Design a protein around this ligand. Structure first.
Ligand SMILES: Nc1nc2c(ncn2[C@@H]2O[C@H](COP(=O)(O)OP(=O)(O)OP(=O)(O)O)[C@@H](O)[C@H]2O)c(=O)[nH]1
Lengths: 80, 232, 69, 49, 488, 82, 72, 94, 75, 82
């Protein structure tokens, strides 16, 4: 995996981002919009839960992720 | 060198501005772009020849369209031109001559009051103009009319105490002016191409000139309409 | 400041989902900006009523469902 | 009023200003209001008679 | 080719947003406002419409150089040869515009720039019948004359939401050259008049009912809009509402950081004057008179506005217009005013009842629509139809009833004999019929096949059951407010 | 103002899905939204965390409980972003 | 008239018993002072683990968010 | 902003926020119970409104308990930042 | 219409039989009568009683309970 | 009075972190937000008896951050004063 040594989150917007969630799932997709409260809008969001064995996988598309239920953000891949 | 403080130096030149590289295009002398106050000066100077009629309504049943209509029906508006005719039920028993149906109407609503119209244009129709002009030595005042019955921050454009600048009294006037002075930039035209005289006879004849002068006016309008009418 | 528009649901019975899979039936009496539901108490989840007039706190609300249309 | 305009114009203007200020921003009597209105109408011509 | 003109082409001027999105939005009601802008003769309503359209679209062909500059008004919604040459809006040449509100939301509006001249009020009546909100528009100068009052009465009697536009401020600032307090007073008088006429709801800049426009210079604002733009930096998030409420309605800032309701010792003017009107005055005064560099600096500082280097060399009117555009970013505040005003959709019932009859079992899924008026919008016969329930698809058969046969039909009910196809559908957009297959509920579209099925102002329907048909109702003939008594 | 909350309110009317902290998904027409995501729906299917589906006419939700909201592909187009 | 905050101001310099939510325990010590946040401080606070004093903690400062209820 | 910090330090000295402020002034080792069960013996360096507190001389005490094998575990850290919400009861050891 | 502030002002003056449920808590309830009210939802309750849930009358007195962990009230 | 001042003044330091669940995080302090959001480049994670999961870049939510183990060469009193 490769990414630029970025200063802040908004500078790397529209990047394929692995986004953890407090309930155990991880949402992977290119981020369109962020917030002061860390609400995120993934362009091609993909629902990936970790069941109690192997990864659960599901496609969502354009979705809002609420900020409170986020654990953290990670860059998965580049734009385009 | 006080009222006419800017133009005075150059108003009488062969080419008004040979250099003045900011104010004109250059020495080719193709385009120009004056600042405000000099434009104001020009306007003031032009008081004798300037169009001097802001109320666009004024040319009512006196536009080129109106003239054309008059032509097309032989319903000459008496202040204006009268042409060679364009061409070579309804009984007294029937109709009721309550309104004596005038020629002025026959061009106003040409398709309605004038039956059997041919080659007839449609004129304008308009809103009432209340451009109140100021006389002198003041600004922003109701004069000609009556009045109605009844966390540490300042508002916008703060530290701009004077509402009106010394030029805005004149700028407003300029803004209301017609096409010559209206604007603060233009392309040149040939002295030839400027019509200092058209604006007098296109607008209405002032007051009680001798018949001959009235005739002259009419003649001029007849020419003008013809020129307008056969686009070359 | 944004007032949750419960005037569509005012004076109607509502199935309020609240903390720990608990339910509350009851006709609505009023509310505030925090979503604290002032409601006429009804049977709580077979089924049994606690209280006559109730005020549920907003933080404890999971949801509130339209029982009456 | 016209005479006032003629010579002591600043005061006349001032008078107008005060009048208007009174006219619209006041719990003013109705007859008085009508008189004022009349005044302004005449002002529009500035005493023809 | 033809003289009495429209677009008649594949390449309709491209929009900033995409029309696919607009049509998608138009799938659901509660997101299609039918505005039907109204007012006296030369209110500026058509000019307002033009402003909106221009704001919406990228580059129009008809938007020539001069109109762009702002010498001539781009009267985009007087498509008829006559309506140009005559200088009057004459028929309904509305547009479908995906309009952004001040708060972030995207609603497709069906505007209708109706005529103002009082002989044409017939045409206007249709707009009232059509539209669920009405942007009444008023000239400041003429104020509310009788015509405006009449319009208001009609709207209230026709059960339609109202959201006023006090238009042509440029006149009172430049033509009349009123002082700012005087201007404020005038405004108050106007709004007072409005309130007097409208016995029910009370209109004001607060609550975002009134809109302060100048379509020649090309700017509208609600106070909410303006405040949002230029009094969000200064004052905090929560106290903004209070500020908004204050601005208008005789409260004086008092040189101090929390105003008094009554008179103040130091300054003279109200908050509305000090905090809006005075700024406008400053703009106008400076956008003519002020040395351009200084103006540029001020714009940079206070408004956060960068003048184009071309705009520096504009003429004083068009320059001013450009500046105004830069200041009041869009016709967004106006849209906010509309949406906020027409947040009641319980009025829909009232409207429908008023038009046809008080009834129910209408949302069974039976498509039915008020055929408003036959128009000649692309030259050809079109029928402007407002759909209420269901959705109409292209190449569908439909029952149609001329509202001559409306009362009679009603009487007879207490055998769908007339019928016709729908050859094509499209959307009015000032100068083009933009073709669309869908024609969803709660909106206005143009259809080919209806026209010849009726004379004026028909109803349509397409029941899937006789029982359903029994449940139906039929619109009354549109009582065109003016009676025609000019016999030729 | 919150540009994701901007999107939510712009998404009103479409068939949107919604899972909470509880893990119980929903799906139906949205009706109302605010700064705090005080969501309302119509025609909403209400699948419990186990998978027990219960169709119902309406629902109202509090924003604190919301986890994520499935928006359609239409809001990808316009007009909130640019 | 007997509100919480004035009774809490009367409860200053008096013995109090603190109960909490998760991984929690009753207490018993003389309240020292309070604020609008309801941050507590006790002297001779005994760690009553479900009403069983596990240890005399003494001079302590309890956080506001984990407070459930406070009694005599 | 300055008046709020003045009443902050004023309300600390009089209120119960004075305790662990005085513990920082005296600079002693203090035990702190935690949300995920960690008795933190450390020297308090920093102190704010929210009870976030940088800790010198750190010594966390806990029990990683799994497999019927009580393994009371503990570690030393040079310096560590504490978040407020984790704290349950701070106490100054005599 | 009755906001929670006004309904609790009825509970303040009345002092009628209140039953309280608790936040993040199903195992225990309370039974008393409302005596206080804060600008927050903090309320002091006299004659309060700890009442474990019907899956007895256990001892409890007068309590200032931190009101940010409330669920039910009903006087 | 704000430790946010100090945490803002902590820049380009390689630090360990704990979370609400208790996950370790070894990475350079790229920046820290006014609400504790630890922006970190060149990061390495290890869960709470579990094996390594190293990564390129992680900005973690402020509230999820439990306890940041600071580096060795660190004068606390130098940054605390203005
Ligand atoms: N001074 C000034 N004049 C304006 C303004 N807006 C419009 N006008 C003028 O008045 C007319 C009113 O606008 P139009 O759109 O042309 O008229 P309209 O609204 O179509 O009137 P109807 O045909 O009755 O609908 C324009 O032709 C302009 O000349 C303004 O803001 N200031």
């Amino acid at each position: 995996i490769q990414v630029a040594h970025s200063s802040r989150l908004a500078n790397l917007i529209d990047y394929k981002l692995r986004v953890l969630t407090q309930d155990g799932r991880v949402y992977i997709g290119q981020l369109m919009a962020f917030d002061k409260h860390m609400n995120l809008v993934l362009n091609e969001c993909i629902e990936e839960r970790v069941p109690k064995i192997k990864v659960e996988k599901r496609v969502l598309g354009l979705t809002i992720l609420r900020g409170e239920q986020i654990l953290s953000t990670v860059v998965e891949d580049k734009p385009l | 060198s006080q009222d006419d403080e800017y133009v005075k130096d150059w108003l009488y030149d062969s080419r008004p501005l040979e250099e003045d590289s900011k104010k004109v295009n250059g020495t080719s002398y193709k385009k120009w772009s004056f600042d405000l106050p000099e434009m104001s000066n020009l306007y003031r100077l032009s008081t004798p020849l300037r169009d001097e009629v802001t109320d666009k309504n004024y040319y009512y049943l006196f536009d080129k369209k109106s003239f054309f209509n008059g032509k097309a029906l032989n319903n000459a508006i008496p202040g204006g031109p009268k042409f060679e005719p364009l061409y070579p039920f309804n009984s007294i028993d029937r109709v009721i001559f309550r309104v004596p149906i005038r020629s002025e109407y026959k061009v106003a609503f040409p398709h309605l009051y004038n039956s059997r119209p041919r080659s007839v244009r449609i004129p304008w129709y308009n809103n009432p103009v209340s451009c109140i002009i100021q006389n002198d030595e003041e600004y922003d005042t109701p004069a000609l009319f009556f009045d109605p019955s009844l966390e540490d921050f300042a508002p916008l454009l703060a530290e701009e105490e004077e509402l009106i600048l010394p030029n805005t009294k004149d700028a407003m006037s300029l803004y209301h002016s017609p096409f010559p002075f209206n604007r603060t930039k233009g392309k040149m035209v040939r002295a030839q191409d400027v019509a200092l005289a058209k604006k007098w006879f296109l607008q209405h004849p002032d007051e009680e000139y001798p018949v001959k002068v009235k005739v002259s006016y009419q003649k001029l309008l007849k020419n003008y309409v013809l020129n307008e009418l056969h686009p070359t | 400041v944004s007032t949750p528009e419960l005037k569509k649901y005012m004076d109607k019975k509502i199935l309020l989902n609240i903390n720990g899979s608990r339910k509350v039936a009851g006709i609505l009496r009023g509310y505030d900006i925090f979503l604290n539901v002032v409601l006429d108490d009804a049977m709580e989840i077979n089924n049994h009523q606690l209280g006559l007039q109730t005020v549920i706190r907003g933080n404890s609300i999971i949801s509130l469902e339209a029982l009456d249309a | 009023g016209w005479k006032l305009a003629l010579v002591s114009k600043k005061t006349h203007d001032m008078i107008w200003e005060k009048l208007r200020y009174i006219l619209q921003t006041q719990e003013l009597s109705s007859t008085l209001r009508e008189s004022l209105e009349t005044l302004f109408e005449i002002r529009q011509k500035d005493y023809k008679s | 080719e033809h003289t009495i003109f429209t677009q008649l082409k594949k390449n309709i001027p491209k929009t900033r947003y995409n029309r696919d999105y607009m049509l998608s939005m138009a799938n659901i009601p509660e997101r299609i406002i039918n505005v039907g802008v109204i007012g006296p003769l030369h209110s500026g309503k058509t000019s307002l419409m033009d402003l909106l359209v221009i704001d919406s679209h990228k580059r129009i062909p008809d938007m020539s150089k001069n109109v762009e500059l702002g010498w001539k008004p781009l009267r985009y919604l007087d498509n008829l040869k006559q309506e140009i040459d005559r200088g009057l809006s004459i028929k309904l040449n509305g547009s479908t515009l995906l309009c952004t509100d001040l708060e972030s939301k995207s609603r497709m509006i069906n505007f209708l720039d109706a005529p103002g001249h009082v002989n044409f009020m017939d045409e206007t009546a249709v707009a009232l019948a059509a539209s669920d909100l009405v942007l009444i528009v008023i000239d400041v100068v003429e104020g509310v004359t009788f015509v405006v009052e009449q319009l208001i009465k009609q709207s209230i009697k026709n059960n339609v939401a109202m959201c006023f536009v006090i238009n042509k401020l440029d006149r009172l600032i430049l033509d009349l050259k009123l002082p700012p307090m005087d201007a404020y007073l005038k405004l108050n008088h106007i709004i007072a008049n409005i309130n007097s006429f409208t016995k029910g709801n009370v209109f004001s800049p607060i609550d975002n009912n009134i809109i302060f426009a100048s379509t020649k210079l090309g700017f509208t604002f609600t106070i909410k809009e303006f405040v949002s733009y230029y009094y969000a930096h200064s004052i905090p998030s929560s106290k903004i509402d209070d500020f908004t409420t204050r601005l208008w309605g005789s409260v004086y800032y008092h040189k101090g950081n929390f105003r008094t309701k009554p008179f103040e010792n130091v300054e003279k003017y109200p908050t509305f004057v000090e905090f809006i009107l005075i700024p406008l005055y400053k703009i106008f005064s400076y956008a003519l008179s002020m040395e351009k560099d200084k103006l540029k600096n001020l714009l940079r500082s206070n408004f956060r506005v960068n003048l184009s280097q071309e705009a520096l060399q504009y003429d004083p009117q068009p320059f001013l217009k450009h500046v105004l555009q830069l200041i009041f970013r869009q016709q967004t505040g106006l849209v906010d005013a509309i949406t906020r005003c027409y947040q009641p959709f319980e009025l829909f019932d009232n409207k429908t009842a008023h038009l046809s009859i008080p009834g129910k079992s209408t949302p069974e899924g039976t498509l039915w629509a008020h055929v408003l008026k036959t128009v000649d919008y692309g030259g050809a016969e079109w029928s402007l139809v407002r759909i209420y329930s269901g959705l109409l698809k292209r190449g569908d058969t439909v029952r149609i009833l001329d509202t001559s046969q409306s009362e009679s039909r009603q009487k007879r009910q207490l055998d769908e004999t007339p019928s016709c196809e729908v050859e094509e559908i499209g959307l009015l957009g000032g100068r083009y019929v933009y073709p669309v297959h869908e024609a969803h509920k709660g909106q206005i579209v143009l259809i080919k096949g209806i026209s010849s099925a009726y004379i004026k102002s028909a109803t349509l329907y397409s029941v899937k059951s006789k029982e359903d048909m029994k449940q139906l109702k039929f619109f009354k003939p549109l009582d065109y407010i003016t009676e025609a008594v000019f016999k030729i | 103002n919150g540009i994701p909350v901007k999107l939510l309110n712009e998404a009103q009317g479409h068939i949107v899905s919604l899972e909470l902290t509880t893990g119980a998904t929903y799906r139906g027409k949205l009706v109302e939204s605010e700064d705090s995501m005080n969501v309302q729906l119509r025609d909403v299917i209400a699948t419990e965390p186990q998978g027990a589906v219960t169709h119902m006419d309406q629902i109202f939700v509090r924003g604190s409980q919301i986890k994520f909201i499935v928006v359609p592909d239409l809001l990808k187009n316009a007009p909130l972003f640019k | 008239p007997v509100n919480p905050k004035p009774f809490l101001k009367g409860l200053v310099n008096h013995r109090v018993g603190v109960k909490l939510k998760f991984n929690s325990t009753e207490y018993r010590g003389t309240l020292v002072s309070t604020d609008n946040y309801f941050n507590l401080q006790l002297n001779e606070a005994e760690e009553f683990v479900a009403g069983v004093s596990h240890g005399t903690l003494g001079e302590i400062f309890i956080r506001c968010n984990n407070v459930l209820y406070i009694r005599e | 902003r300055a008046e709020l910090e003045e009443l902050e330090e004023f309300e600390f000295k009089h209120g119960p926020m004075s305790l662990i402020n005085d513990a920082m002034v005296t600079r002693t080792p203090v035990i702190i119970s935690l949300r995920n069960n960690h008795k933190i013996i450390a020297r308090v360096k920093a102190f704010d409104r929210h009870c976030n507190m940088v800790l010198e001389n750190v010594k966390e005490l806990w029990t990683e308990k799994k497999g019927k094998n009580v393994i009371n575990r503990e570690r030393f850290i040079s310096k560590l930042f504490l978040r407020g919400d984790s704290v349950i009861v701070v106490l100054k050891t005599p | 219409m009755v906001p929670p502030i006004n309904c609790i002002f009825n509970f303040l003056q009345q002092q009628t039989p209140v039953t309280i449920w608790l936040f993040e808590q199903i195992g225990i309830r309370i039974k008393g009568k409302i005596v206080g009210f804060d600008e927050f939802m903090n309320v002091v309750i006299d004659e309060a009683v700890e009442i474990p849930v019907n899956s007895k009358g256990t001892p409890l007195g007068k309590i200032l309970l931190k009101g940010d962990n409330i669920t039910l009230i009903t006087s | 009075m704000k430790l946010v001042n100090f945490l803002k003044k902590l820049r380009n330091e390689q630090v360990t972190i704990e979370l609400k669940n208790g996950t370790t995080v070894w990475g350079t302090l790229q920046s820290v937000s006014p609400q504790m959001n630890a922006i970190l480049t060149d990061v390495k994670l290890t869960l709470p008896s579990d094996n390594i999961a190293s990564l390129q870049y992680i900005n973690i939510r402020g509230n999820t951050i439990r306890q940041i183990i600071l580096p060795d060469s660190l004068n606390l009193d130098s940054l605390l004063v203005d």
